[PDB]
Amino acid sequence: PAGRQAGQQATVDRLRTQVTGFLSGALGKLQALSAQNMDPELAQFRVLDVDRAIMPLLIVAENARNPGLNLVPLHMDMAEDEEVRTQPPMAGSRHIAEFVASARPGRYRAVIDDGSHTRAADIRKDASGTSVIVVDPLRKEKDESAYVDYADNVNMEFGEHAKCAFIPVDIQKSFFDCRILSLSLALKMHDKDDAFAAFHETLRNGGDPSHHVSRAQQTEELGATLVLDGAPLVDARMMKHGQAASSVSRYLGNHPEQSTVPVNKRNETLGERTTRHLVKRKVRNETKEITFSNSVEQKRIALLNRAASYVNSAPPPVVMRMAKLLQDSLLD
């Protein structure tokens, strides 16, 4: 091991210990809460702070575990407004305009922060320009006209000549699970790389989006494609972490063919897996007892487990890089 240490075996070892120490610290706390069926918000646990700090490290690990994922943290311009935003962007996050301008041509996934909420994205950039497919894990808008302006603002961030599709999906119910959900969606995008790529071509050629999705419309101010029904592009595997049982149930009721496909290697269907994750606990409105799927909180724990294992045996430059990312979370 000394060969790759470059003579700082002590510093590398201590920084490795420090990173695994933090991950294991967060992991332990999250595991205690989940095992005891306890709401984090009622337990005074600050998931938002922990999610923001671990997220750059999760991206490093996921990129290494899946070569080609090419996951990049991005933020919209409003995320740079310290007066309105809930949190500053995660460490290493890049402004969209800056990314689009200077990034090497290729295929990217992204988690995109607007200052208070995070979405997932699949991005294709080449000589002809940039096309992006945005999937929002949250779908809370009463009037479905608010999504039209969402599609615009995203397309505006990438430039008006960029092709854009905006797909709001009813997955998130809590207020703080957008980051982990978007990370999961990014991974699924990589999983369905060819399906999203085909959609990119259609967007770039101005073809019929109905070859990829069930219901779509052009916004007609930027020409962005708003997708109010993403199936089959948004399949059962992307609905796995649905927090409300009714969201999963309603989805299957709307796309019955998705109810029998296996969503993991243990051959569970979406319904079987969701039912397995159902819990009943007190949360905050003072308190409310509800039934929902704790699938997301398990996912966060699984991701931390991955990240910790990766750091344990990661090469020294990676340890350095992840230690710095952890430290830089305190710069804003």
Ligand X SMILES: O=P(O)(O)O[C@H]1[C@@H](OP(=O)(O)O)[C@@H](OP(=O)(O)O)[C@@H](OP(=O)(O)O)[C@@H](OP(=O)(O)O)[C@H]1OP(=O)(O)O
Q: Say which DSSP state 104 is in.
A: P
E strands, 158-255, where?
163-168, 213-218, 225-232
Closest separation between CB of residue 264 and ligand X, Å?
Answer: 3
Q: Could you tell me which residues are beta bridge partners of residue 260?
A: none
Q: Which is nearer to ligand X, 58 or 96 (CB)?
A: 58
- The answer to whether residue 278 forms part of the interface with ligand X (CB under 6 A) is no
Indicate which single residue of 119, 273, 277, 300 sits in contact with ligand X (rule: CB under 6 A). 273
**Can you tell me the distance from the alpha carbon of 84 to that of 312, in angstroms, rounded to the nearest whole number?**
38
Angle between helices 295-313 and 316-328 (to 10 degrees): 130
Q: Does 187 bind ligand X (CB under 6 A)?
A: yes
- Neighbouring CB atoms inside 10 A of 142's CB total 6
DSSP state of 331: -
Q: Is 13 in the site for ligand X (CB under 6 A)?
A: no
CA-to-CA distance for 33 and 313, rounded, in angstroms?
28
Among 93, 130, 184, 274, binds ligand X (CB under 6 A): 184
Q: How far is CA 93 from CA 1, 202, 205, in A?
A: 32, 29, 31
Q: How far is CA 269 from CA 235, 257, 273, in A?
A: 12, 11, 6
Tokens of 285: 């409105």
> Is residue 299 close enough to count as binding ligand X by CB under 6 A?
yes
Q: Which residues pair with 109 in a beta bridge?
A: 71, 122
User: In whole angstroms, what is the distance from residue 117 CA to residue 85 CA?
Assistant: 9
Q: Does 142 bind ligand X (CB under 6 A)?
A: no
Q: Which residue is nearest to ligand X (CB)?
A: 265
Residue 14 in the binding site for ligand X (CB under 6 A): no
266 binds ligand X (CB under 6 A): yes
173 labeled part of a ligand binding site:
yes
Instruction: State yes or no: 65 annotated in a binding site.
Output: yes
The stretch near ligand X (CB under 6 A) out of 41-49, 126-134, 199-207, 259-267 is 259-267
Span near ligand X by CB under 6 A; candidates 51-59, 150-158, 185-193, 313-321: 185-193
Shortest Cβ 110–ligand X spacing (Å): 16
Task: Give the position of tokens 């308190």.
Answer: 287
Q: How far apart are CA 9 and CA 273, in angstroms?
A: 45
Tell whether residue 293 is a contact of ligand X (CB under 6 A): no
Kindly indicate which of the ranges 6-14, 20-28, 257-265, 311-319 contains the residues binding ligand X, using the contact rule CB under 6 A: 257-265
Please state whether beta strands 71-75 and 94-95 pair in parallel, antiparallel, or not at all (unpaired): parallel
The span from the CA of 44 to the CA of 50, in Å, is 12
Write out the E strands in 182-270: 213-218, 225-232
Integer Cα distance of 141 and 139 in angstroms: 6
Of 25-33, 183-191, 193-201, 279-287, which segment contacts ligand X by CB under 6 A?
A: 183-191
Please check if 188 is assigned to a binding site: yes
Which residues 226-245 are close enough to bind ligand X by CB under 6 A?
237, 240
Q: How far is the CB of 172 from ligand X (least distance, A)?
A: 15
Q: What are φ and ψ of residue 199, in 5° steps?
A: -65, -35
Instruction: Judge whether 29 is annotated as a binding position.
Output: no
* Residues contacting ligand X: total by CB under 6 A: 12
Nearer to ligand X, 87 or 298 (CB): 298
Binding characters for ligand X, 41-80, by CB under 6 A (x = yes): ----------------------------------------
Contact residues for ligand X (CB under 6 A)? 184, 187-188, 191, 237, 240, 263-266, 273, 299
Q: Which residues are annotated as a binding site for CoA?
A: 173, 246, 288, 291
Q: Which residues are annotated as a binding site?
A: 65, 173, 188, 237, 240-241, 246, 264-265, 273, 288, 291, 299, 306
Q: Which residues are annotated as a binding site for 1D-myo-inositol hexakisphosphate?
A: 65, 188, 237, 240-241, 264-265, 273, 299, 306
